[PDB]
Design a protein around this ligand. Sequence first.
Ligand SMILES: *[C@@H]1O[C@H](CO)[C@@H](O[C@@H]2O[C@H](CO)[C@@H](O)[C@H](O)[C@H]2NC(C)=O)[C@H](O)[C@H]1NC(C)=O
Ligand SMILES: *[C@@H]1O[C@H](CO)[C@@H](O)[C@H](O)[C@H]1NC(C)=O
Ligand SMILES: *[C@@H]1O[C@H](CO)[C@@H](O)[C@H](O)[C@H]1NC(C)=O
Lengths: 161, 116, 61, 198
Amino acid sequence: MLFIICLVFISCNVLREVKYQETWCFPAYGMVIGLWLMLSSPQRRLVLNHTRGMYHFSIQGRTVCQGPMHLVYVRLALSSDAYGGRFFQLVLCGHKLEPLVLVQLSYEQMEFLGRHLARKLNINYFDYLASSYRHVVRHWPLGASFSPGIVQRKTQVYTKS
Amino acid sequence: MRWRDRIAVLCFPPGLMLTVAALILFFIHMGVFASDVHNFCVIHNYDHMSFRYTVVLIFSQVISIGWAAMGSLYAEMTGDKFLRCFALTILILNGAMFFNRLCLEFLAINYREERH
Amino acid sequence: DVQEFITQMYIKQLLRHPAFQLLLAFLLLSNAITIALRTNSYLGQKHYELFSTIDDIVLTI
Amino acid sequence: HADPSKPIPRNQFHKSKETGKYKQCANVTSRAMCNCSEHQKFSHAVAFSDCKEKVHRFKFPVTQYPVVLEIFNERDKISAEPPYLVTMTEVNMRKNWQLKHNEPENVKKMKHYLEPLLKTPVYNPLGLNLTIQGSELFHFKVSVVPGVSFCELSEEFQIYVDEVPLPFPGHALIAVATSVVLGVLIFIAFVFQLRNIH
Ligand SMILES: *[C@@H]1O[C@H](CO)[C@@H](O[C@@H]2O[C@H](CO)[C@@H](O)[C@H](O)[C@H]2NC(C)=O)[C@H](O)[C@H]1NC(C)=O
Ligand SMILES: *[C@@H]1O[C@H](CO)[C@@H](O)[C@H](O)[C@H]1NC(C)=O
Ligand SMILES: *[C@@H]1O[C@H](CO)[C@@H](O)[C@H](O)[C@H]1NC(C)=O
């Protein structure tokens, strides 16, 4: 969310110098300024340890968590809209990472780099081999502990009747 | 001892960031209200109050209430009972400040200036 | 990711909820009545305090 | 309506106590010692204020209040003419009032010359309109500009506007009050539902 830190901090600067010349109306746009630096802080880098089928989460060189990737496949959950709309949410291996959802899904090049990446990461691209509508089977490696959802992950998945 | 060691190394789950960010706001507000109710009442001085910032005070108190709400549910969504008995007060705690900072305004209404 | 959908589920079940819509309609309709009554110099003053309050309440909502 | 042998309406604050002076009925203790004639009470002049008790009352916004100025010349009383340009001041120093006037091309040059020298705007009689946005007494003073008469022409009147609706921080505040008061009840359900599912 450094883009927001990039966004708010710029707004503060343009709001840093001004001449309102109005009674009261105290120039207290600095309440934004704190919100700028707040989201600024620690780069995240995730490495696919496909050699042992592992996935360890860390950022800025400090491990947070790890888990094996024995069952590996690409899944994208449906994020429906209150209007008559369809949006994409990408949840891979039934885990809660940074959302790799399909941006501007409502993009062929956007999904093209994914197939190379899924080929680069050596995991199946289920939502790409057949990409028309909501069709993905989550792999959910047995290394994860998403029991209320990992089992439920297939429940939302269609078994093709 | 595990609980602190983890979050000492790295960042925090979302609920902690917002909720505590309303505790500082609760103090920053508790200071100003104290001085304003000081000057209105004890030194009986009507010059060193707010009324130059009567909007930013109220605006923040809305943020300080809202941010507590968003942070609270995350704790209750996680369900940690320690947070659960913690944040709920902070919602009602800042709920006390808002209903007090609002009666200090209808009291110092004939002491601020004029607009109509 | 598991949690906020419920919060999104909550946002939907509130915003799309019909009691909320009915309340907002009631407020906007009352404000329209106030506008119609303000189109009268006499009643413009007597309840000026009420019309101004309603005027601001609807805007904040 | 100074009856000095009484308490005083607003002494909270120190500066208010310091800024006080009884110009008439100045040292006596019983309002009895000072003599206020009936005409003294009736007239709106300054230095007659201590004898003033009854004033003209006005409903909140006073809009288009006509300031009719009549010049009396023994045999006749004529209306105030554009040559007799005039200035309005508020002796009590209040500043929530406006004056509207029409400027015909007979004073564009009189008005433009006098305003920097006098440092106070000059108005055209016969078209004066007064507008008031206040909740208490207003004491105005009408003075013909110097240099056009040998006799200072002047005039005093008082307006007490009551029924003012509310100082600003009292509608934006009620607005935010109801919203947050509502928004809490909304927040109640969101938490309350979590305990029900659990
Ligand atoms: C001050 O107010 C008076 C109203 O008492 C205005 O006089 C009216 O002026 C209009 C022209 O706009 C005439 O049609 C009316 O007949 C006038 N009424 C009276 C009673 O004279 C006057 O115009 C206002 N002053 C200014 C500068 O606008
Ligand atoms: C009392 O007031 C009178 C004004 O009527 C003034 O001349 C006199 O100096 C005052 N004396 C004292 C002691 O205040
Ligand atoms: C008022 O009149 C009385 C007599 O009626 C007189 O004794 C008194 O001096 C007068 N007041 C003043 C301030 O002179």
